[PDB]
Amino acid sequence: KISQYACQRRTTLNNYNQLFTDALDILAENDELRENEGSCLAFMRASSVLKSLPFPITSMKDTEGIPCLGDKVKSIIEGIIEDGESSEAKAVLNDERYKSFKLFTSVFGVGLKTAEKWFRMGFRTLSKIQSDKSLRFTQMQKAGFLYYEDLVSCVNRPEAEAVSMLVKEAVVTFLPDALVTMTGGFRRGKMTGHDVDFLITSPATEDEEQQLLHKVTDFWKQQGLLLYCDILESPSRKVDALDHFQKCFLILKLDHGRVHGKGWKAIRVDLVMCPYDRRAFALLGWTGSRQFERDLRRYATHERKMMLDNHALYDRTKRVFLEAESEEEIFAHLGLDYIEPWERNA
DNA sequence: AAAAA
DNA sequence: TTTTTGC
DNA sequence: TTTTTGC
DNA sequence: AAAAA
Ligand SMILES: [Mg+2]
Ligand code: NA
């Protein structure tokens, strides 16, 4: 019935097991900070498989037949079926390491290692951190502190629609033939997001594309609507977290009047530039979710003896690179039924 | 993957 | 070298 | 038991 | 922490 793979389950934003998944998300994040990568992912898969259920769990008889639920997970569910609360998750939420890790990493530029550095030093608040002379923050870390309250108050659908109008007009100006598609959470029909993602491709000067990202940003800097900027340069690809595509991580100023206190709002924007021939691979890889993508790869590997990434799909048996002009072709190659963006919310 | 430190 | 960034 | 768990 | 080899 139900598959252990996120790519073989239709997961919508209509969750009936929110009580359970919230508890499991906390328990995963707890093993994330302790670097217990195996345990972390176990709770990530249990929480993911539950978000796919077309009904709410009311009894233990309901869990039977559902994969990714072993002893530990079935007990979390057992604990919630009665109380209506998780004693495991309510414990983690009241832990100093966790509270501080969750807090510190919520800053743009701060991750696992820096949060652990600050916590070991004896820090617990972002205020005592900011008011220290002995410390030295990066260009990401300074921007993260500067626009904290605005980046922490996650983006909304009208705000994302204002950004997508601004990004398209600026990209359309320096390149008119280019197709610009909004990726990430907002492509999967989300209402709230941490950031706004985009994919840029034009059907195509090898020299012109390389200037595209710089053309649109410098143009936004001339208007002074570019608060933060960082650009990155562009077979059988593996052990590479982020793809080999040209890309940029920005913080842009969104004037209140463009979206239908101070008159502004800092918004996190990710732009990705890829060759036209890779459009399908890039879109699939940037739509997400995290759990859908990692399972797409895990499926290809373990079930199809193939190699999936954001650039291509390689069949090891037939020793050929399977091309695609759409997402539907990549799914068909993998022998997976099509799961449209809105149902990739794993 | 790149780019900062 | 080590850290951060992304779905 | 030992290995894998996403690029 | 769970499932496969
Ligand atoms: Mg996003
Ligand atoms: Na961060």
Tab-separated table of C-alpha atoms (C1' of nucleotides) and ligand atoms in Angstrom:
chain	number	residue	atom	x	y	z
A	1	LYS	CA	0.000	0.000	0.000
A	2	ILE	CA	2.240	2.815	1.437
A	3	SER	CA	5.902	3.080	0.324
A	4	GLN	CA	8.989	3.964	2.479
A	5	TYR	CA	9.835	6.378	-0.438
A	6	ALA	CA	8.528	10.021	-0.481
A	7	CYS	CA	8.485	9.961	-4.317
A	8	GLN	CA	5.852	7.086	-4.219
A	9	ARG	CA	3.381	8.870	-1.922
A	10	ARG	CA	1.175	11.885	-2.645
A	11	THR	CA	1.794	14.299	0.306
A	12	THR	CA	-0.383	17.455	0.420
A	13	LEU	CA	-0.353	20.379	2.883
A	14	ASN	CA	-3.624	18.855	4.253
A	15	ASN	CA	-2.065	16.962	7.219
A	16	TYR	CA	-4.364	15.029	9.601
A	17	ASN	CA	-1.513	13.907	11.901
A	18	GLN	CA	-0.095	17.412	12.832
A	19	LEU	CA	0.000	16.426	16.582
A	20	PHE	CA	2.360	13.499	15.739
A	21	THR	CA	4.536	15.075	12.999
A	22	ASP	CA	5.256	18.233	15.117
A	23	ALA	CA	6.536	15.927	17.931
A	24	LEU	CA	8.644	13.881	15.454
A	25	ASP	CA	10.085	17.093	13.825
A	26	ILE	CA	11.334	18.194	17.286
A	27	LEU	CA	12.781	14.693	18.005
A	28	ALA	CA	14.566	14.694	14.572
A	29	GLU	CA	16.053	18.248	15.198
A	30	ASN	CA	17.209	16.995	18.599
A	31	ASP	CA	19.314	14.270	16.962
A	32	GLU	CA	20.371	16.825	14.234
A	33	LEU	CA	22.194	19.079	16.811
A	34	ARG	CA	23.858	16.071	18.528
A	35	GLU	CA	25.000	14.991	14.948
A	36	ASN	CA	23.130	11.608	15.372
A	37	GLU	CA	22.459	11.566	11.542
A	38	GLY	CA	20.873	8.076	11.445
A	39	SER	CA	18.411	8.638	14.338
A	40	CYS	CA	17.639	12.181	12.982
A	41	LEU	CA	16.583	10.826	9.552
A	42	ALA	CA	14.547	7.983	11.176
A	43	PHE	CA	12.232	10.581	12.832
A	44	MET	CA	12.337	12.578	9.538
A	45	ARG	CA	10.943	9.572	7.628
A	46	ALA	CA	8.340	8.691	10.313
A	47	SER	CA	7.111	12.348	10.382
A	48	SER	CA	7.107	12.360	6.535
A	49	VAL	CA	5.194	9.083	6.015
A	50	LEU	CA	2.452	10.360	8.496
A	51	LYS	CA	1.951	13.752	6.642
A	52	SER	CA	0.897	11.536	3.612
A	53	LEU	CA	-1.929	9.681	5.487
A	54	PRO	CA	-5.386	10.621	4.165
A	55	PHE	CA	-6.873	10.279	7.728
A	56	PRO	CA	-5.811	10.997	11.402
A	57	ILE	CA	-4.314	8.285	13.688
A	58	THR	CA	-6.775	7.629	16.563
A	59	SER	CA	-5.599	4.074	17.518
A	60	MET	CA	-2.477	1.834	17.224
A	61	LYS	CA	-4.439	-0.458	14.832
A	62	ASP	CA	-4.219	2.516	12.366
A	63	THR	CA	-0.335	2.569	12.319
A	64	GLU	CA	-0.101	-1.120	11.180
A	65	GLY	CA	0.926	-1.341	7.510
A	66	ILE	CA	2.707	2.045	7.513
A	67	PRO	CA	6.500	1.867	6.853
A	68	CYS	CA	9.304	3.902	8.586
A	69	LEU	CA	7.545	3.281	12.016
A	70	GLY	CA	9.597	0.991	14.283
A	71	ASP	CA	9.621	0.618	18.090
A	72	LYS	CA	10.677	4.174	19.141
A	73	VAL	CA	8.177	5.899	16.740
A	74	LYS	CA	5.188	3.639	17.594
A	75	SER	CA	5.767	4.564	21.310
A	76	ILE	CA	5.757	8.353	20.509
A	77	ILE	CA	2.329	7.721	18.764
A	78	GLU	CA	1.245	5.543	21.729
A	79	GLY	CA	2.081	8.441	24.104
A	80	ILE	CA	0.071	10.987	22.049
A	81	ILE	CA	-3.059	8.743	21.434
A	82	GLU	CA	-3.805	9.030	25.247
A	83	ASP	CA	-2.418	12.342	26.686
A	84	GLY	CA	-2.820	14.355	23.478
A	85	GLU	CA	0.785	15.530	24.147
A	86	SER	CA	4.364	14.117	23.635
A	87	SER	CA	6.444	13.752	26.869
A	88	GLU	CA	9.534	13.112	24.669
A	89	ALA	CA	9.048	16.311	22.570
A	90	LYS	CA	7.906	18.450	25.607
A	91	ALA	CA	11.277	17.411	27.234
A	92	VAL	CA	13.457	18.376	24.188
A	93	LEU	CA	11.583	21.766	23.934
A	94	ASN	CA	12.728	22.408	27.594
A	95	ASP	CA	16.438	21.532	26.971
A	96	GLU	CA	19.136	24.273	26.965
A	97	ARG	CA	21.174	22.768	24.064
A	98	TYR	CA	18.067	22.393	21.864
A	99	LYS	CA	16.405	25.763	22.743
A	100	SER	CA	19.767	27.542	22.012
A	101	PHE	CA	20.576	25.516	18.828
A	102	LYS	CA	17.056	26.227	17.481
A	103	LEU	CA	17.473	29.904	18.343
A	104	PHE	CA	21.052	30.523	17.115
A	105	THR	CA	20.625	28.683	13.725
A	106	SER	CA	17.480	30.734	12.983
A	107	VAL	CA	19.974	33.564	11.995
A	108	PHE	CA	21.023	33.735	8.297
A	109	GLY	CA	24.707	32.748	8.279
A	110	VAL	CA	24.618	30.630	11.509
A	111	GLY	CA	24.563	26.818	11.301
A	112	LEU	CA	25.324	23.714	13.395
A	113	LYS	CA	29.015	24.495	14.073
A	114	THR	CA	28.674	28.203	14.967
A	115	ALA	CA	25.593	27.514	17.285
A	116	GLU	CA	27.653	24.787	19.089
A	117	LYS	CA	30.636	27.276	19.306
A	118	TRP	CA	28.423	29.970	20.906
A	119	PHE	CA	26.709	27.460	23.260
A	120	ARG	CA	30.016	25.955	24.500
A	121	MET	CA	31.261	29.525	25.293
A	122	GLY	CA	28.239	29.900	27.626
A	123	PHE	CA	25.885	32.026	25.453
A	124	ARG	CA	22.080	31.543	25.539
A	125	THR	CA	20.574	34.784	23.965
A	126	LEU	CA	21.129	36.477	20.538
A	127	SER	CA	21.345	39.848	22.400
A	128	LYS	CA	24.378	38.864	24.535
A	129	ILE	CA	25.950	37.394	21.311
A	130	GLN	CA	25.469	40.650	19.312
A	131	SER	CA	26.786	42.830	22.213
A	132	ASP	CA	30.218	41.029	22.340
A	133	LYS	CA	33.560	42.604	21.217
A	134	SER	CA	35.695	39.353	21.309
A	135	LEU	CA	33.514	37.791	18.498
A	136	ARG	CA	33.741	38.359	14.714
A	137	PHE	CA	30.711	37.798	12.435
A	138	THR	CA	30.733	36.990	8.679
A	139	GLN	CA	29.086	39.000	5.862
A	140	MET	CA	26.132	36.547	6.087
A	141	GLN	CA	26.043	36.670	9.940
A	142	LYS	CA	26.000	40.506	10.057
A	143	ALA	CA	23.157	40.665	7.428
A	144	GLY	CA	21.308	37.933	9.378
A	145	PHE	CA	21.407	40.036	12.587
A	146	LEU	CA	20.629	43.328	10.802
A	147	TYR	CA	17.362	41.980	9.241
A	148	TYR	CA	16.583	39.283	11.889
A	149	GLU	CA	12.952	40.144	12.916
A	150	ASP	CA	11.911	40.456	9.200
A	151	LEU	CA	13.655	37.264	7.944
A	152	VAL	CA	12.384	35.396	11.056
A	153	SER	CA	8.795	36.536	10.290
A	154	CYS	CA	8.394	34.127	7.383
A	155	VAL	CA	7.193	35.367	3.893
A	156	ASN	CA	3.498	35.157	2.734
A	157	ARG	CA	1.782	34.253	-0.625
A	158	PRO	CA	0.985	37.979	-1.548
A	159	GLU	CA	4.647	38.944	-0.601
A	160	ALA	CA	6.003	36.057	-2.757
A	161	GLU	CA	3.722	37.204	-5.635
A	162	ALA	CA	5.200	40.769	-5.271
A	163	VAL	CA	8.790	39.327	-5.417
A	164	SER	CA	7.978	37.115	-8.483
A	165	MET	CA	6.723	40.267	-10.314
A	166	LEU	CA	9.987	42.144	-9.417
A	167	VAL	CA	12.341	39.192	-10.269
A	168	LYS	CA	10.588	38.511	-13.649
A	169	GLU	CA	10.623	42.218	-14.755
A	170	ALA	CA	14.356	42.547	-13.890
A	171	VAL	CA	15.311	39.195	-15.539
A	172	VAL	CA	13.043	40.008	-18.552
A	173	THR	CA	14.831	43.406	-18.963
A	174	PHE	CA	18.392	41.966	-19.470
A	175	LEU	CA	17.034	38.785	-21.247
A	176	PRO	CA	13.502	38.797	-22.812
A	177	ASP	CA	13.350	35.192	-24.221
A	178	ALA	CA	14.151	33.724	-20.763
A	179	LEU	CA	11.646	31.517	-18.893
A	180	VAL	CA	11.559	32.285	-15.152
A	181	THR	CA	9.807	29.748	-12.891
A	182	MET	CA	9.319	30.174	-9.092
A	183	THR	CA	10.574	26.995	-7.332
A	184	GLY	CA	10.593	25.732	-3.685
A	185	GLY	CA	7.751	25.891	-1.127
A	186	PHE	CA	5.696	28.432	-3.111
A	187	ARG	CA	5.718	26.178	-6.232
A	188	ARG	CA	4.223	23.402	-4.011
A	189	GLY	CA	1.264	25.691	-3.154
A	190	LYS	CA	2.517	26.882	0.232
A	191	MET	CA	1.106	29.959	1.956
A	192	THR	CA	4.129	30.771	4.176
A	193	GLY	CA	7.854	30.336	3.358
A	194	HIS	CA	11.286	31.109	4.858
A	195	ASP	CA	12.477	32.336	1.391
A	196	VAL	CA	11.354	32.737	-2.311
A	197	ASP	CA	13.164	30.467	-4.827
A	198	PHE	CA	13.482	30.924	-8.635
A	199	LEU	CA	14.831	29.179	-11.709
A	200	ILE	CA	16.191	31.210	-14.620
A	201	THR	CA	16.888	29.768	-18.138
A	202	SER	CA	16.815	31.285	-21.687
A	203	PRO	CA	16.462	29.181	-24.920
A	204	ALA	CA	21.111	31.369	-24.954
A	205	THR	CA	24.601	32.951	-24.899
A	206	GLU	CA	27.160	30.945	-22.806
A	207	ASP	CA	28.803	34.325	-22.043
A	208	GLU	CA	25.421	36.159	-21.639
A	209	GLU	CA	24.063	33.712	-18.987
A	210	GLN	CA	27.229	34.189	-16.827
A	211	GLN	CA	26.500	37.938	-16.799
A	212	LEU	CA	22.683	37.508	-16.233
A	213	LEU	CA	22.874	37.060	-12.386
A	214	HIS	CA	25.230	40.073	-12.118
A	215	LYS	CA	23.091	42.208	-14.472
A	216	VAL	CA	19.876	41.757	-12.416
A	217	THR	CA	21.579	42.234	-9.006
A	218	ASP	CA	23.689	45.337	-9.928
A	219	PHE	CA	20.389	46.761	-11.377
A	220	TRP	CA	18.664	46.186	-7.941
A	221	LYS	CA	21.748	47.671	-6.143
A	222	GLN	CA	21.444	50.869	-8.300
A	223	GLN	CA	17.832	51.132	-6.946
A	224	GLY	CA	19.259	50.233	-3.508
A	225	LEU	CA	16.749	47.372	-3.111
A	226	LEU	CA	19.659	44.820	-2.698
A	227	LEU	CA	20.448	44.643	1.089
A	228	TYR	CA	22.616	41.452	0.783
A	229	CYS	CA	24.280	39.666	-2.180
A	230	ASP	CA	26.405	36.553	-2.741
A	231	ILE	CA	26.969	34.939	-6.215
A	232	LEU	CA	28.466	31.449	-6.915
A	233	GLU	CA	30.272	30.343	-10.166
A	234	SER	CA	28.893	27.519	-12.384
A	235	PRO	CA	28.728	13.767	-15.129
A	236	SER	CA	28.064	10.963	-12.509
A	237	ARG	CA	27.976	13.831	-9.927
A	238	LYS	CA	28.027	12.835	-6.190
A	239	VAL	CA	29.117	14.137	-2.654
A	240	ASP	CA	28.006	17.707	-3.661
A	241	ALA	CA	25.297	19.247	-1.333
A	242	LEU	CA	24.587	22.230	-3.586
A	243	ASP	CA	24.461	21.816	-7.415
A	244	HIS	CA	27.085	23.019	-9.960
A	245	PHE	CA	24.692	25.691	-11.334
A	246	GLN	CA	25.424	29.429	-11.246
A	247	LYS	CA	23.370	30.830	-8.282
A	248	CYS	CA	22.864	33.677	-5.750
A	249	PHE	CA	21.537	33.981	-2.126
A	250	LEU	CA	20.057	37.438	-1.563
A	251	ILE	CA	18.195	39.626	0.944
A	252	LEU	CA	16.046	42.144	-1.073
A	253	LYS	CA	13.960	45.186	0.029
A	254	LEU	CA	10.258	44.812	-0.784
A	255	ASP	CA	8.454	48.221	-0.626
A	256	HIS	CA	5.062	47.814	1.187
A	257	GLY	CA	3.142	49.263	-1.818
A	258	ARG	CA	4.382	46.511	-4.232
A	259	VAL	CA	2.577	43.825	-2.141
A	260	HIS	CA	-1.272	43.814	-2.376
A	261	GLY	CA	5.964	50.482	10.420
A	262	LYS	CA	9.062	51.392	8.335
A	263	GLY	CA	7.697	50.954	4.767
A	264	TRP	CA	10.007	48.015	3.955
A	265	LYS	CA	10.479	44.209	4.499
A	266	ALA	CA	13.674	42.184	4.018
A	267	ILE	CA	13.049	39.026	1.953
A	268	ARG	CA	15.406	36.102	1.326
A	269	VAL	CA	15.640	35.302	-2.449
A	270	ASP	CA	17.516	32.405	-4.160
A	271	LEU	CA	18.118	32.687	-7.962
A	272	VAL	CA	19.444	29.701	-9.970
A	273	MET	CA	20.771	29.885	-13.542
A	274	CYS	CA	21.080	26.690	-15.578
A	275	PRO	CA	21.565	25.671	-19.270
A	276	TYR	CA	18.278	25.084	-21.175
A	277	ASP	CA	19.116	21.330	-21.641
A	278	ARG	CA	19.105	20.826	-17.798
A	279	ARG	CA	15.837	22.864	-17.111
A	280	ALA	CA	13.846	19.698	-16.195
A	281	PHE	CA	16.543	18.381	-13.782
A	282	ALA	CA	16.998	21.832	-12.115
A	283	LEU	CA	13.162	22.425	-11.741
A	284	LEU	CA	12.618	18.940	-10.250
A	285	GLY	CA	15.620	19.452	-7.938
A	286	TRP	CA	14.510	22.951	-6.826
A	287	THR	CA	10.725	22.303	-6.372
A	288	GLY	CA	11.497	19.939	-3.453
A	289	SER	CA	10.622	19.158	-0.726
A	290	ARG	CA	13.888	18.099	1.025
A	291	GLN	CA	12.353	14.642	1.773
A	292	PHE	CA	10.941	14.224	-1.712
A	293	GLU	CA	14.480	15.004	-3.265
A	294	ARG	CA	16.561	12.761	-1.048
A	295	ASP	CA	14.081	9.916	-1.568
A	296	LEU	CA	14.102	10.456	-5.366
A	297	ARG	CA	17.883	9.819	-5.235
A	298	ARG	CA	17.539	6.913	-2.775
A	299	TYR	CA	14.880	5.336	-5.031
A	300	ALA	CA	17.015	5.737	-8.221
A	301	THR	CA	20.073	4.298	-6.462
A	302	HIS	CA	18.569	1.331	-4.489
A	303	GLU	CA	15.623	0.515	-6.758
A	304	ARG	CA	16.602	1.547	-10.337
A	305	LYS	CA	20.463	1.200	-10.237
A	306	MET	CA	20.587	4.838	-11.547
A	307	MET	CA	22.105	8.168	-10.357
A	308	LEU	CA	19.843	11.219	-9.859
A	309	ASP	CA	20.998	14.864	-9.206
A	310	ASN	CA	19.996	18.435	-10.196
A	311	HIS	CA	21.943	18.243	-13.514
A	312	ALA	CA	21.053	14.840	-14.968
A	313	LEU	CA	19.886	11.203	-14.540
A	314	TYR	CA	22.428	8.448	-15.374
A	315	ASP	CA	21.480	4.759	-15.869
A	316	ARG	CA	24.486	2.638	-14.733
A	317	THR	CA	23.237	-0.625	-16.339
A	318	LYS	CA	22.615	0.921	-19.807
A	319	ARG	CA	25.703	3.275	-19.219
A	320	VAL	CA	23.700	6.262	-20.670
A	321	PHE	CA	22.562	9.746	-19.478
A	322	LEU	CA	18.757	9.813	-19.783
A	323	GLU	CA	17.689	13.314	-20.952
A	324	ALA	CA	14.303	15.065	-20.283
A	325	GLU	CA	12.484	18.171	-21.584
A	326	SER	CA	10.055	18.098	-18.593
A	327	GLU	CA	9.691	16.693	-15.049
A	328	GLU	CA	7.236	14.047	-16.366
A	329	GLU	CA	9.956	12.450	-18.513
A	330	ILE	CA	12.380	12.145	-15.458
A	331	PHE	CA	9.575	10.393	-13.466
A	332	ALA	CA	8.836	8.067	-16.445
A	333	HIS	CA	12.559	7.200	-16.749
A	334	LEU	CA	12.637	6.308	-13.027
A	335	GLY	CA	9.481	4.195	-13.480
A	336	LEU	CA	7.638	6.420	-10.982
A	337	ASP	CA	4.066	7.720	-11.472
A	338	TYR	CA	3.935	11.577	-11.795
A	339	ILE	CA	3.588	13.445	-8.465
A	340	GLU	CA	2.877	17.099	-9.372
A	341	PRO	CA	4.481	19.977	-7.295
A	342	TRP	CA	1.469	20.435	-4.897
A	343	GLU	CA	1.809	16.690	-3.803
A	344	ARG	CA	5.613	16.737	-3.156
A	345	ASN	CA	5.205	18.139	0.393
A	346	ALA	CA	7.090	15.321	2.182
B	1	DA	C1'	29.184	22.904	-6.229
B	2	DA	C1'	31.381	28.190	-4.507
B	3	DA	C1'	33.259	31.692	-1.365
B	4	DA	C1'	34.483	33.408	3.047
B	5	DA	C1'	37.565	33.274	6.793
C	1	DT	C1'	41.077	23.765	6.207
C	2	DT	C1'	36.185	24.569	8.140
C	3	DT	C1'	31.694	26.474	7.641
C	4	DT	C1'	27.366	27.967	5.196
C	5	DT	C1'	24.367	28.050	1.716
C	6	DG	C1'	19.983	25.079	-1.127
C	7	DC	C1'	15.630	21.666	-2.198
D	1	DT	C1'	25.982	-8.741	12.837
D	2	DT	C1'	27.415	-4.822	9.552
D	3	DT	C1'	26.108	-1.333	6.393
D	4	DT	C1'	23.231	2.597	4.649
D	5	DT	C1'	20.584	6.349	5.161
D	6	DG	C1'	20.793	12.495	-0.941
D	7	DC	C1'	22.812	15.365	-3.705
E	1	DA	C1'	16.427	4.674	14.540
E	2	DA	C1'	14.968	1.697	10.894
E	3	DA	C1'	15.697	-1.493	7.078
E	4	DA	C1'	18.561	-3.877	3.913
E	5	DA	C1'	22.533	-6.695	2.663
F	1	MG	MG	11.921	28.488	-0.212
F	2	NA	NA	21.314	29.829	9.651
